[PDB]
Amino acid sequence: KRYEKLDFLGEGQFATVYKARDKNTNQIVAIKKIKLGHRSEAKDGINRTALREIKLLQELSHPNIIGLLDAFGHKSNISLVFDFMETDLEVIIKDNSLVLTPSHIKAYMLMTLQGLEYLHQHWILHRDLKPNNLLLDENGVLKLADFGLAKSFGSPNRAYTHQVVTRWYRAPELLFGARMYGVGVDMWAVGCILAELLLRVPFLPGDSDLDQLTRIFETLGTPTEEQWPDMCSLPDYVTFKSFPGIPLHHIFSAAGDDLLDLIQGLFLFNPCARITATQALKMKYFSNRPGPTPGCQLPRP
Amino acid sequence: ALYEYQPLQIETYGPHVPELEMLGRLGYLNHVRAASPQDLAGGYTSSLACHRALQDAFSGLFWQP
Amino acid sequence: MYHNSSQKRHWTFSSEEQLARLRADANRKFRCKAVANGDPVFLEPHEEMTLCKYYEKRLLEFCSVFKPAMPRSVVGTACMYFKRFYLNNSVMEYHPRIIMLTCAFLACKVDEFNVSSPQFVGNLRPLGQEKALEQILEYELLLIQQLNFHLIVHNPYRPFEGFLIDLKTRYPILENPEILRKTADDFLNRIALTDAYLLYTPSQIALTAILSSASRAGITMESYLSESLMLKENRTCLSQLLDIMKSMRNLVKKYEPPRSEEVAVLKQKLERCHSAE
Amino acid sequence: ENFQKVEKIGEGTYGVVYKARNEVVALKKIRLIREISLLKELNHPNIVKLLDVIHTENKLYLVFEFLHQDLKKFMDASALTGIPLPLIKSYLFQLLQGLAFCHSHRVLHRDLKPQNLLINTEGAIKLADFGLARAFGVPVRTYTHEVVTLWYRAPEILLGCKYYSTAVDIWSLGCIFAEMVTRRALFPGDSEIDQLFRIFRTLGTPDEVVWPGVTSMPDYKPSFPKWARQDFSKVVPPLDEDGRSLLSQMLHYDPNKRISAKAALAHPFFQDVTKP
Ligand SMILES: Nc1ncnc2c1ncn2[C@@H]1O[C@H](COP(=O)(O)OP(=O)(O)O)[C@@H](O)[C@H]1O
Ligand SMILES: Nc1ncnc2c1ncn2[C@@H]1O[C@H](COP(=O)(O)OP(=O)(O)O)[C@@H](O)[C@H]1O
Numbered sequence A: 001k002r003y004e005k006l007d008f009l010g011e012g013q014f015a016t017v018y019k020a021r022d023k024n025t026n027q028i029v030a031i032k033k034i035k036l037g038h039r040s041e042a043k044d045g046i047n048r049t050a051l052r053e054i055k056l057l058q059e060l061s062h063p064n065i066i067g068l069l070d071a072f073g074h075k076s077n078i079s080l081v082f083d084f085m086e087t088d089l090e091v092i093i094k095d096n097s098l099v100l101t102p103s104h105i106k107a108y109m110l111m112t113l114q115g116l117e118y119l120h121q122h123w124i125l126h127r128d129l130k131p132n133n134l135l136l137d138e139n140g141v142l143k144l145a146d147f148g149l150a151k152s153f154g155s156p157n158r159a160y161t162h163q164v165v166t167r168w169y170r171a172p173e174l175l176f177g178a179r180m181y182g183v184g185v186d187m188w189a190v191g192c193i194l195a196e197l198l199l200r201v202p203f204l205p206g207d208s209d210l211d212q213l214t215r216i217f218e219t220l221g222t223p224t225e226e227q228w229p230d231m232c233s234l235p236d237y238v239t240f241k242s243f244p245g246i247p248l249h250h251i252f253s254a255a256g257d258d259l260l261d262l263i264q265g266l267f268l269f270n271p272c273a274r275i276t277a278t279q280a281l282k283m284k285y286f287s288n289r290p291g292p293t294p295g296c297q298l299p300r301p
Numbered sequence B: 001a002l003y004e005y006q007p008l009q010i011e012t013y014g015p016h017v018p019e020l021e022m023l024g025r026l027g028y029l030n031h032v033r034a035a036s037p038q039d040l041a042g043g044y045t046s047s048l049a050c051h052r053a054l055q056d057a058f059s060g061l062f063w064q065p
Numbered sequence C: 001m002y003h004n005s006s007q008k009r010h011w012t013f014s015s016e017e018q019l020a021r022l023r024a025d026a027n028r029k030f031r032c033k034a035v036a037n038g039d040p041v042f043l044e045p046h047e048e049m050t051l052c053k054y055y056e057k058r059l060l061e062f063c064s065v066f067k068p069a070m071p072r073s074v075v076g077t078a079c080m081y082f083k084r085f086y087l088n089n090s091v092m093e094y095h096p097r098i099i100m101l102t103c104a105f106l107a108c109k110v111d112e113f114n115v116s117s118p119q120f121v122g123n124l125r126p127l128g129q130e131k132a133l134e135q136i137l138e139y140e141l142l143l144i145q146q147l148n149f150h151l152i153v154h155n156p157y158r159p160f161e162g163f164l165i166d167l168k169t170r171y172p173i174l175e176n177p178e179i180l181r182k183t184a185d186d187f188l189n190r191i192a193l194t195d196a197y198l199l200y201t202p203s204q205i206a207l208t209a210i211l212s213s214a215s216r217a218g219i220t221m222e223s224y225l226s227e228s229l230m231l232k233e234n235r236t237c238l239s240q241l242l243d244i245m246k247s248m249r250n251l252v253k254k255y256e257p258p259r260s261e262e263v264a265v266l267k268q269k270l271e272r273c274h275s276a277e
Numbered sequence D: 001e002n003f004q005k006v007e008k009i010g011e012g013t014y015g016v017v018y019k020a021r022n023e024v025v026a027l028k029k030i031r032l033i034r035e036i037s038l039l040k041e042l043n044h045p046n047i048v049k050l051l052d053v054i055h056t057e058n059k060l061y062l063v064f065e066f067l068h069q070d071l072k073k074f075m076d077a078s079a080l081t082g083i084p085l086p087l088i089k090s091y092l093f094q095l096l097q098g099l100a101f102c103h104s105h106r107v108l109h110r111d112l113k114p115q116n117l118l119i120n121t122e123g124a125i126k127l128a129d130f131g132l133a134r135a136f137g138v139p140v141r142t143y144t145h146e147v148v149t150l151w152y153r154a155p156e157i158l159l160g161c162k163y164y165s166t167a168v169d170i171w172s173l174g175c176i177f178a179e180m181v182t183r184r185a186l187f188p189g190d191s192e193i194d195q196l197f198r199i200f201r202t203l204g205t206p207d208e209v210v211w212p213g214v215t216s217m218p219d220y221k222p223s224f225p226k227w228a229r230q231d232f233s234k235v236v237p238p239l240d241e242d243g244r245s246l247l248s249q250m251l252h253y254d255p256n257k258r259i260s261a262k263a264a265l266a267h268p269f270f271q272d273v274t275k276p
């Protein structure tokens, strides 16, 4: 009876989110109640996804990462308490009434990259980056969320499960079945998110894994063995027809030179060569003018 | 107000850990398992494993409760 | 990372006096609850410690013979869960057998070691297995609450490997640090028997094990501390590190394993206490 | 008011499932059209029965007969001893009768899997989970971004075909059949491409001789590895000649050549079928 449920926010396949108040600080919070699921998963105890989110968010503290305020339950039921976020980036993108100026795009990129840099310094991969996982508060602060797929990286012999992001933002090494990877997967997702911000529509909207690979290669060209040295050794590799690709200044006609360099860095086929969050933050595009807009001035749907 | 990159500073309470790119040149990578070509195709290098092991070895080495 | 972890903030304590105080407070609180509910059946805190040590050994055995192969880090996490739970709770309220099984079960899920619950409960030694699974499921949330939802446990094994890499790289005096691995591993086991996991950082434990093995082998490695770690410039820090290691070695030699007959008497007492309330 | 809730069963894609008592029944509480209507239409001994639909202003309640466990849990329990061959045959017969009834009414399950097949104590098995069902042409749920299990998808779906036929259900059933005989998944793929390559490595790579129109599929690639077709003797040792023949007819690459449920019911495999 600590929380007074007062609104229904949404229901997913694996959880249900409500609005509530703490009754002690009168703070508005979001409660994510985790579903038991099927009869078999109910007998296995508390959901592994909830345990993953709890164990990862208890060890992280950054302005641009969602904060876990509390967690309770009864028997195998469990509820996670988060700070309430007004909206997310997907709602901003699909809202035709608001204009995304270059400064807004730079600000949204900056907050995402700083959160990602803090996350990667602690040897954690988000693995589920997409516009609806970047939540916006009333003060225009972006936070990464939905840590149900996040996992620590760095220790060898830790292939583990094959869970991957939705295919529109999956990196080509993931689409080829790579089990061991680094920060490149999140960086490719970040490039896809930036492309979505620039075009206001999904950049590579494939309807299947093979269709996603086909779209990647038609838009950015089929990579050779010089660009991706050991690409043919991935478990789910298939040879493709060679595509010239489209020059990036044609796809993003309004993009300047610095933004173009950032995009090429984010969309490199070699996972090792792909820029990291620190390298991306040091890129000249962020230090150039105009600067990112203050969070209080960011567009609100 | 232009943005300027400021490095992320976290206190580790331990000896300085060498930078990731320097590991091979300083000879650290001669004492870790090499990364297979399949591992390399995904972006996983031996430098990451060595860096993680060293950071854990030096984390909080001299910190008092 | 450990240096901003919940283990460092909330689960490393200044002295074993604090540990004894928390355990005595738990014992007294349970006694007050029982006597307000409505005397020789009560167990004193040292008897509780003996029982906790015995069941920690049992948990080690269980995680050793577990199939499929239980990763050593998962075993470490389970043992740390057991220690943290019985720091603030009494064995007279929650039976150490069920709690040890629940600790192993939560450790397997937290450390991403995927095992189906029927197989886990089949590792036990029929209907009894089903009942045991039922109790494990009933105590999972209790254990997680008693841990304050702090599930990541930093073990000394990874710092051990990091130190071995650093010694192989920057300490040519040691011809082969791998000669020190067996004896350092044994010393790590002995340390894990004591309460040092609640008193020292994992890197300190690993380095203490390494230097203890070096000393037993006859090699002297004060050069590694003074020179390689750049401690020759800061001597007070070197003194603190050496005193930490000396305290850890003292804890290791002062440890006493539980005696069989005392364990039998205490087990009878605990069983009688778990059938009368 | 009449129903006394006993306990919570599970919380699937929508709503909550409750063991209740009036007879032990299952109650689904949905937040508050095609699915309920489809369930009323589908009356059959081998389909889960929609007993009553209680309607409230902000809630919906559906009553079903209670089935004590599903097939997946049953196979998990019988992992060592196995499932007796007569039980396999009876379960397959009942599932095929239910499938034939669904297909006669232009209904496409699309999501057959052992976890969606509910059994009871007396040896009956029923189809459930009609959330991905396709009645006539329209889907029952127009907007559902739910993940789908991948181990029982037909190759035509894996190659991007948008024309769903009834044969896909037959494909899934065949896989389940094989699983019940081997206590292991036939095609346990980690992804779509791995799923397709496991299928190819088990049955051979499809060419225009065996599957005409396969090279013009939306996601067909000429560079696909050309695996050979291993015989069915190694893939499913325990099965007999009639069972192997039925499995082969159920696992044809070409959907048009794939066996139908009514035609499957007339197979010699079920000559001596008796429910145990
Ligand atoms: N802290 C929060 N404040 C407000 N809304 C939230 C919060 N966290 C999640 N949500 C809402 O819940 C929805 C789903 O959250 P998510 O964690 O992505 O669920 P799933 O893991 O099932 O995809 C999002 O669309 C988001 O709008
Ligand atoms: N009539 C019933 N008898 C027994 N169990 C049922 C019944 N109906 C549903 N269930 C169980 O309730 C759980 C929730 O199922 P449901 O939400 O309907 O499936 P889905 O989420 O896959 O659409 C499932 O595990 C199912 O086995």
Ligand SMILES: [Mg+2]
Pocket: A132, A133, A146
């Ligand atoms: Mg989400």
Ligand SMILES: [Mg+2]
Pocket: A146, A147, A148, A149
């Ligand atoms: Mg999620």
Ligand SMILES: [Mg+2]
Pocket: D116, D129
């Ligand atoms: Mg389902």
Ligand SMILES: [Mg+2]
Pocket: D012, D013, D129, D130, D131, D132
């Ligand atoms: Mg469903």
